[PDB]
Amino acid sequence: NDRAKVILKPDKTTITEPHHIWPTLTDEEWIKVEVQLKDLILADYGKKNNVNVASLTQSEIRDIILGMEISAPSQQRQQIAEIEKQTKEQSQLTATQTRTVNKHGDEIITSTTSNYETQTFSSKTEWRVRAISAANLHLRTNHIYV
Amino acid sequence: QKELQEKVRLGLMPPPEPKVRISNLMRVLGTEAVQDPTKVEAHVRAQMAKRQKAHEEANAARKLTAEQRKVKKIKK
Amino acid sequence: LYSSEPTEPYLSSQNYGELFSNQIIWFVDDTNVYRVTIHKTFEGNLTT
Amino acid sequence: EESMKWKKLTNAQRSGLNQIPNRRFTLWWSPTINRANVYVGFQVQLDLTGIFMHGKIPTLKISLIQIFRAHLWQKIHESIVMDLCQVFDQELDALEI
Amino acid sequence: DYWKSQPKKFCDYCKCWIADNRPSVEFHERGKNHKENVAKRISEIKQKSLDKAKEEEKASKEFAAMEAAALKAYQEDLKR
RNA sequence: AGCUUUGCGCAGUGGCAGUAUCGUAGCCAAUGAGGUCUAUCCGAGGCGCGAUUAUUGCUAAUU
RNA sequence: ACGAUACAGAGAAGAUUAGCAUGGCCCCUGCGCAAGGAUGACA
RNA sequence: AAGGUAAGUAU
RNA sequence: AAGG
Q1: Which residues are listed as membrane-spanning (chain D)?
Q2: Cβ A117–D89 below 8 Å, yes or no?
């Protein structure tokens, strides 16, 4: 609100009639005023969303100017999209050997490359997580309960 | 029409821009009209005025001079 | 099989161009019907 | 289904498009038609799925293939396993794990 | 309930259809049959190129001989 | 000197309908096409074939 | 001589999408072309 | 006894 | 890749 009011009156010469809400600007001046207001809107949207106004496309700019809300998908919704769609450019770059059985009930050792049941569970006990957990451990040292 | 299309395809003529009116403003450039309403309005009105000016220039260019009107009348 | 109430035409970013017709349209907004003003005092108390 | 009802289509195309109501009906009642008590015979396990077909019900098989596309069965199993992994990770000390 | 058919790729060398994704395509290309078909296609291309070169040089020689004969006939007709 | 009628072009603006618009070195036709009503009366194209997203182009997307 | 394996697996649907201009029809306006109609004006 | 074969590509 |  505050910056928009200053934009609407570029100079003290520009005045509003008592019966007109908006300033009396010529047709050409309104172009510059609208450009300035659009720059205001885009800059504040970027500030609130930590994005650059240069990369926004024309449709995105129109959505920002209008009330259309480009809401970030939730963590649940992000997982749904991964499951709903086939793996992107799935590359079977990793082969895993497991002890399984065939269709005739014979124990067999098979090497498989399909990227299913291959997600890694990073637990709180896994040393990889605990290594960075123990990093910067002096934070707990400054505050003690002696 | 075929000659104009051949000129456009050959590159000798720029492709024709869509004809835009006041009622056609949003349907042609709604994305551009939202960001810059007055600028798009000015562009549309400039195109319409260019078309009207071309029409008037064609009509007036081919107009019987006042003395030439008499010459045709003085002869018939 | 659907559960949500059947979806009616909505003014979206797609049909926004259709809004600019020659017919009469009205925009009804009731956001500022019940309106209150609160001030944050420096003591930490806020008034209404 | 609505859009294709008013398009220029050949007889084979329209015949194929009249089966969607039957597919919907078959999959709606699938836990009843697809039974070993109803269709006495051998079972065939649907590929990429844990579903056993007690008879060739192509009207049901086609619509079951869509539901478990993109390895949905494997993804469901993996997601449940992972969720239980987080559940048991959150309770390491209480459960003495 | 709309049916979306998965894209399919046609391997010209083996004259077979395979799924259009990286795993299936790379598995097919890494196979022995695909390599054999590619080598056979290269050999056939080379053989066809050599055969066409031989045919065109033979045609050039034949046309030169026929042109010389026709020129001789035209000269002896002019002298007549 | 203005005004105004008809036809033909050239443009501009606007409205309407896409079961229709064209093509005719095919045929017939005011030396009569075609006639349910009005028949000692009506008077102009008809038919066959071909083109097509029921005129055809570009432009923008996805590809 | 299948089958077992490893991989893919939506194993049954040109599902396309908007803009403009042309084209048809019907006015209106301006200009040109060729013809014409009716009327007004004292020394 | 059937009307209950996925079509494959690799090894 | 293995089987008659």
Answers
A1: none
A2: no
